[PDB]
Write a protein that binds this ligand. Structure first.
Ligand SMILES: NC(=O)C1=CN([C@@H]2O[C@H](COP(=O)(O)OP(=O)(O)OC[C@H]3O[C@@H](n4cnc5c(N)ncnc54)[C@H](OP(=O)(O)O)[C@@H]3O)[C@@H](O)[C@H]2O)C=CC1
Ligand SMILES: NC(=O)C1=CN([C@@H]2O[C@H](COP(=O)(O)OP(=O)(O)OC[C@H]3O[C@@H](n4cnc5c(N)ncnc54)[C@H](OP(=O)(O)O)[C@@H]3O)[C@@H](O)[C@H]2O)C=CC1
Ligand SMILES: NC(=O)C1=CN([C@@H]2O[C@H](COP(=O)(O)OP(=O)(O)OC[C@H]3O[C@@H](n4cnc5c(N)ncnc54)[C@H](OP(=O)(O)O)[C@@H]3O)[C@@H](O)[C@H]2O)C=CC1
Ligand SMILES: NC(=O)C1=CN([C@@H]2O[C@H](COP(=O)(O)OP(=O)(O)OC[C@H]3O[C@@H](n4cnc5c(N)ncnc54)[C@H](OP(=O)(O)O)[C@@H]3O)[C@@H](O)[C@H]2O)C=CC1
Lengths: 381, 381, 381, 381
């Protein structure tokens, strides 16, 4: 019969209006300053551009060995040219109060070194996965972390991905019933021509093949989906002996595991087949299928029962949660500010590494490896 | 047998490396400076945050009537507080050489006014849709544009959306064969409680109901999907007489059209049903289904034939094209820099408006309205 | 831990076992005897082969005008060669008690007449859609049903299709909220060289084009999905004047309808675009998409909301309900054997015909056509 | 513009018409006569009701150990009550020429014996999977086939399922590129109260658990999809020791296989998780996902690449190929009536059994089991 107050009170002339409804994460502040170490493929394609959607994180400095490149990136992101560090004067960041943390995005064999040096420089540390190329090196990073009394977070973006958390949540609500079989596959074609992949073929730098690089998603995903650690693993690996790509690191590798709850799992990673990111979780009441499972974008999950397939994915007009990249960056920022622990701590990064070494060991011996060493997930999966 | 050169040459020590492969649009420069007019729902939720992924555009100034708010946004996006203009001193932007264009994101009834004023201020103009609330006002904007010798672009984000362009491309390659029936639906529940929706219920400000606000997507989409203009339209509209939301503007409205090629179409817009963005294009060889069709995210298209459904959507790890928002902003920027016309010019915005007036007219009279007035799409759909 | 009684109680030797569990419709008897009139495309492609799955129906006799054909068919389905009638002695069926009802699968113009004739033969009538090419003929068929005091059921299989039934159930359960917009489309490329399609091009035999043949699905559907009749309708039709196929019947026609509840709808049918059968029901809580909406097999429905897509389809190992065809058949059988009214009475087929003539009028006159004539769905949609 | 000759040449009166077009498999004859042994769950839920769709097959007689049951069934399918055999006089079938072959649908332990007996009865043998619970028994059944000089075909329906056939065709067409990883999963919650499931819990009648019953699909599938046999295999099995269901047979077992081409695979089967039938074939050009992969109905395949999902399924109005069941039946009929070898010879069912025993060994011993024994798929996968 008549227009409601609100509409009726809108000026017909240009007038100031209120703060709008927010349908997506709005920026807030830029108090937590990062220093990015290693201007590479994942840094320039996903992380740097991922800062824009942060509500607390910003880029303060760059650390690269390619002067020409740092220069370009610096200008591309408004970073002060004076904040460009090379791998030598890296430790000087300790004199810059505006640098709260570093984000190590270097090849695997170098993580430990810069994590420690960063800590000695009195800075917090975000380090990419795989954590390091040895269990011992993982522990040394943890040690150094405790010594500097600083946080240590591993770059597990899936622990901050809406769809993944959505998946973890439905499992915890028992929509799948008792869990019994988890399947995983993570693959992408290895191109030795790509600069980023060249060190991944070097065992000394990569620390391993497809399992260290992408298999780790199925392994880690298997763990937070089930909400527990495996007690024993078995594995077999094969690589074409004529393929120049796999002279030092493994191409394809399969590994099955048993958990203390009785569930089993069988996953695989591959460097010779096209894009695959698919997780399957069989319960006795329903089956969860994630595909895409660990993508940078477009994740899709579906719960299946005879005659049904209830799918879930990000919405078309609203963005209920922040994207994994921005969420991850803000996560360490928030943990520092609120004096709280991170959900993806060094211990978590180390658990995957020990786990992988066990899988490689079971692959080499052809025998099962007991992994019932009592790792406990602080905070929950 | 052995590792390829590239891998073999990677230092085992921290060393500068090359520029990485780019799997997504990388930033480049920030030469084109915008001045945003109207810090509202669409501005703070989609546009402002959409600048980050631009390769040439940046935010130079803000124009708002809410001092407190502009202040906050300014700080949120690094805009110099001195570049905050209110609706009164708006014309002063003419003294700032660093402001190449304005982006009008005000309610419909105010577009014309600020587009013109912007032009008199010697600035280029990006104006949201619907263009204006009258055909005449559309023409006045065009006139003013020609007078200042500046570009006039209407905010048709779908004209820069990967999946939509992908859809336009498959139709042009005749994968659907001869086109005969196009169906569209665009709806979302109107909430008078939301500040952004309050002026949309006012005819004087909105210029109309669901057709002016969201029906325009089906209308415009119908046009670039077919690649031609309609020669006649028919329409009927209904709104619950007791619903306070629709006292001045229409809730639901249906309109069917005929094109010079023989194709027909039947679409609708709605303010009382939940989220719907679905386009259907029937050819005699195949059928295209877009759903989501015009979302901010997650668009999905599928070509269907008996026993088949070939779907397309953005990839999980690579981003072949830039997102509509960033693409749109950079589009006007590029057109200025390269002295080229925009794909979404004022004439295009005016064509939709005339078209809508015709539909409203056919709804009021209950008679068909001839729209065979020879509008020609400069550049292609 | 020891095996259950039942397991350990099984003979490791050839022994008899109980009646296995039924995971799909089980055959029972063949009490009902059908006489199928007109051995055409539908009759031989879907209907006859659909008796096999019936639970209370059998093919007792045939009625063909091509004896040679009827002999070959009679063989394939093992019907008594002595029971092969013709359109002349069709009435003699009244002498066989083994023939309880007849199934008229003849052109729309020959529907009414063979229904009335069959009613005097004291038999039950299963008549294909559309009921007839005249509202009056529809009425006479009814009158001839009351007189002979037999059952009159129209071939609306969608009224017996699991998924279509699932669609109505969720809507009735208010899963979509307040219904406000329905969109339907039905299409398939008209092949004049097809013997079956040749009488559809003739308006005297078909009684209409596109709408009378497949648009009726959208029209009927909209009605049981919404669960209410239109009170007003508008429509437009167009056909290429140079296409020899639509010299007498409409190729494409679009119709808009308004309902008492306030809900609106817009649907269409086409003879010149490839396979399309899609229903869309928009509520304020969720949107339902049936696609395929009305196929012989493979129907699919989905309930959409931002971020979710809950799809339903026939299971992959079980079969909770029988196929629409066998279900339509036995439905008449059970209707009589229980003195229960049929879900698709002749009064239901009549409403569609009145509504279609009303639409053709709206299209022909170009004005609204009040269809508020107090029809009532006896038994519910 | 005038209607085509055919259209205007149709009588507006009851007249005969030609044979309609066939949009689905048409019945022809019933030359072949089957004798179905063991009236169980599969026999009555899928097989018998699948003869209706056959083109060259008929149910000539039954073989039951529960006369009462066999009388009721014989009725439903109209079989001659005088042709209801028993496991004692089963051999007398050799006296009826109307019985060309028998279909053994008995527990795995009673497969071989009734096959050899039937061969002496000079009849063709259709034997369900697994062939037998012993490689030797498999061999004897074969020998008894050569002797009697009759056909020996195993019930591999997937070898006759449209979609499964579509899967092989696209792979053979190199749409996925170089095959490198296959992932299979088959599962369904074991119900001990089900008469049919009670002999599966008994390892003497079943000859194995999870793998022998459904894992065989993954195993078989992997083989025809890849189109080559494994040369080596590894596996692990685990079952809850407190579950009375898996006291004698395995609940969940996982197996990894390597192929000559270099391709690898990892698949699993489960008795304690709900419905799962998913195949995954990874190549370097695309990935194929079958899901449902091997159902009775509703199979679905998709070919994936970044940004694309090309799905295939049975059309919604047509039926290009007959259902796996009727197709499996007639396939034996046609095999004889043309002196052509069957696609699923006994030599094919034997390979699966040798491979399964090899797997059980690998799981039991925990070591690799060379399966490189020169088998060859006579006739192709
Ligand atoms: N979580 C995720 O989704 C992903 C995580 N990652 C992780 O990020 C880290 C970096 O990998 P990515 O960006 O893909 O690879 P890149 O090869 O592209 O970059 C590695 C960067 O580290 C620096 N660097 C220093 N010494 C060396 C060296 N000797 N060899 C190679 N690089 C060196 C270089 O920086 P500069 O040139 O500027 O001196 C280089 O740009 C890895 O640990 C990887 O596991 C990678 C992809 C995805
Ligand atoms: N292309 C797309 O996808 C979309 C386009 N739009 C378009 O953007 C434009 C803005 O709409 P939207 O952001 O949703 O709406 P809002 O109501 O949220 O904002 C309108 C803005 O304009 C200014 N304004 C000045 N005078 C008035 C007035 N009298 N009444 C209301 N606002 C006034 C205000 O800015 P300040 O307070 O700072 O002074 C206000 O924030 C519209 O023309 C709309 O069609 C909207 C959504 C999507
Ligand atoms: N509900 C559904 O899904 C469907 C319903 N139908 C309906 O079934 C009915 C039959 O159509 P359909 O089977 O497709 O078409 P056909 O042309 O293939 O068959 C028509 C049948 O009617 C008989 N007939 C008698 N006189 C004529 C005549 N003058 N011209 C043509 N046929 C004649 C013929 O029998 P004989 O040759 O033996 O002499 C012929 O078999 C229609 O009412 C149609 O709407 C059709 C498809 C689907
Ligand atoms: N390929 C496929 O998709 C499928 C294949 N199968 C196969 O079919 C075969 C039969 O299994 P299924 O029908 O599911 O099982 P059931 O338990 O339901 O039936 C077994 C049948 O064998 C006869 N039988 C004779 N001796 C015994 C005995 N000692 N214990 C149990 N039954 C006996 C019975 O006949 P009667 O009662 O009349 O005396 C009974 O009907 C198996 O080889 C199975 O693997 C099963 C499902 C699917």
């Amino acid at each position: 019969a008549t227009l409601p107050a609100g509409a009726s009170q809108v000026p017909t002339t240009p007038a100031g209006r209120p703060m709008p409804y927010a349908i997506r994460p709005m920026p807030e502040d830029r108090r937590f300053g990062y220093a990015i170490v290693g201007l590479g493929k994942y840094a320039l394609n996903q992380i740097l551009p991922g800062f824009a959607g942060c509500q607390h994180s910003r880029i303060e400095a760059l650390v690269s060995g390619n002067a020409e490149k740092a220069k370009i990136v610096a200008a591309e992101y408004g970073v002060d040219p004076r904040k460009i560090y090379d791998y030598s004067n890296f430790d000087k960041i300790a004199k810059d109060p505006k640098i709260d943390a570093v984000y190590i995005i270097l090849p695997n064999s170098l993580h430990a070194e810069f994590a420690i040096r960063a800590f000695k420089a009195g800075k917090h540390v975000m380090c990419e996965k795989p954590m390091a190329t040895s269990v011992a090196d993982c522990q040394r990073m943890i040690d150094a972390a405790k010594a500097a009394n600083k946080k240590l977070m591993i770059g597990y973006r899936c622990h901050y991905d809406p769809m993944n958390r959505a998946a973890v949540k439905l499992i915890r609500e028992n929509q799948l019933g008792k869990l019994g079989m988890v399947t995983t596959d993570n693959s992408d074609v290895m191109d030795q021509n790509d600069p980023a992949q060249q060190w991944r073929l070097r065992r000394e730098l990569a620390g391993g093949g497809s399992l260290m690089d992408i298999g780790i998603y199925g392994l880690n995903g298997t763990r937070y989906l089930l909400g527990e650690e495996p007690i024993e693993v078995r594995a077999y690996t094969y690589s074409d002996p004529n393929d120049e790509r796999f002279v030092e690191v493994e191409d394809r590798i399969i590994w099955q595991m048993r958990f203390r709850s009785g569930a089993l799992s069988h996953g695989a990673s591959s460097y010779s087949t096209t894009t695959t990111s698919r997780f399957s979780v069989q319960g006795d009441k329903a089956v969860l299928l994630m595909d895409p499972a660990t993508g940078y974008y477009q994740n899709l999950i579906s719960v299946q029962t005879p005659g049904h397939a209830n799918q879930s994915m990000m919405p078309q007009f609203i963005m209920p949660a922040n994207n994994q990249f921005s969420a991850q960056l803000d996560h360490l920022a928030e943990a520092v500010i609120n004096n709280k622990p991170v959900r993806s701590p060094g211990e978590e990064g180390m658990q995957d590494v020990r786990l992988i070494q066990a899988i490689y060991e079971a692959a080499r011996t052809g025998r099962p490896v007991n992994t019932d060493w009592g790792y406990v997930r602080q905070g929950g999966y």
